[PDB]
């Protein structure tokens, strides 16, 4: 079977709220080393990869690799029924079409038991070979999100430029253009994470702002976000989940021809 017990269950709520606006249907490839899922958006333009490892759970138990197809919207609807201090447990019997969710309250008086109708879905997994990127910037999640929203109100396309001096975000629209510049001053901590730009080669690409604002819905997961990129490859937005694992967003650039 499959049985997982997670105490600080706010994490799962935040993940489901992060993925509800990008993917509607996805298979949860529940393995033995952990749970991961990899899927594309409703327009086949971006790629999501979530990875949680068994060591990060408080009680993990799996017997056979299964791929349970879940409607992310319905899953989030059910997960909204739990408080941010609840203890959430996932359970699924060997080859079943329903997922079991159990929410424990901070006190033991109230216990909630939901059951979600699962569905079959075959995901033709693609696969990202792990390469080394030209520039990797690590900044605060909230700062990145603020930049994304502010620049989204100008136009709908952003131009990211990594260089020796700093990293620059540009946009241009009907009402003018805008530019944001970052500096790597003395790095006090990774909490107020000053922008750390590790550059190997200078790079600049263009992306659509809508999908970046979709990505920034995963802000409550970490306090720092890492943007990794190199020329003519998809940008990687990595939100590291505390201990558990990570969540990666791959986004295709806007090119010419």
């Amino acid at each position: 079977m499959f049985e997982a017990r997670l105490v600080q269950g706010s994490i799962l709520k935040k993940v489901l709220e992060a993925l509800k606006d990008l993917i509607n249907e996805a298979c949860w490839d529940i393995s033995s080393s952990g749970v991961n899922l990899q899927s594309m958006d409703s327009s086949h333009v971006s790629l999501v990869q979530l990875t949680l490892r068994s060591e990060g759970f408080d009680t993990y138990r799996c017997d056979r690799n299964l791929a349970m197809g879940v409607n992310l919207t319905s899953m989030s609807k059910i997960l909204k029924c739990a408080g941010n201090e609840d203890i959430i447990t996932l359970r699924a019997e060997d080859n079943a079409d329903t997922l079991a969710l159990v929410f424990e309250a901070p006190n033991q008086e109230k216990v909630s038991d939901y059951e979600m109708k699962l569905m079959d879905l075959d995901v033709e997994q693609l696969g990202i070979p792990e390469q080394e990127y030209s520039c990797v910037v690590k900044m605060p999640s909230g700062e990145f999100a603020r930049i994304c929203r502010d620049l989204s109100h100008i136009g709908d396309a952003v131009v990211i430029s990594c260089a020796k001096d700093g990293v620059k975000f540009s946009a241009s629209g009907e009402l003018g253009n805008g530019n944001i510049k970052l500096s790597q001053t003395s790095n006090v901590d990774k909490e107020e994470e000053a922008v750390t730009i590790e550059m190997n080669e200078p790079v600049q690409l263009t992306f659509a702002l809508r999908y970046l604002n979709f990505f920034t819905k995963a802000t409550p997961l970490s306090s720092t976000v890492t943007l990794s990129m190199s020329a003519d490859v998809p940008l990687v937005v990595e939100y590291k989940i505390a201990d558990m694992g990570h969540l990666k967003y791959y986004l295709a650039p806007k090119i010419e021809d």
């Binding site: 086949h44 333009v45 971006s46 790629l47 033709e124 997994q125 693609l126 696969g127 990202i128 659509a208 490859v233 998809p234 791959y250 986004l251 295709a252 650039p253 806007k254 090119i255």
Partner: peptide, 11 residues
């Protein structure tokens, strides 16, 4: 806009 399937490949 790019694809991104023009970047990775399953089947």
């Amino acid at each position: 806009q790019c694809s991104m399937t023009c970047f990775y490949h399953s089947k």
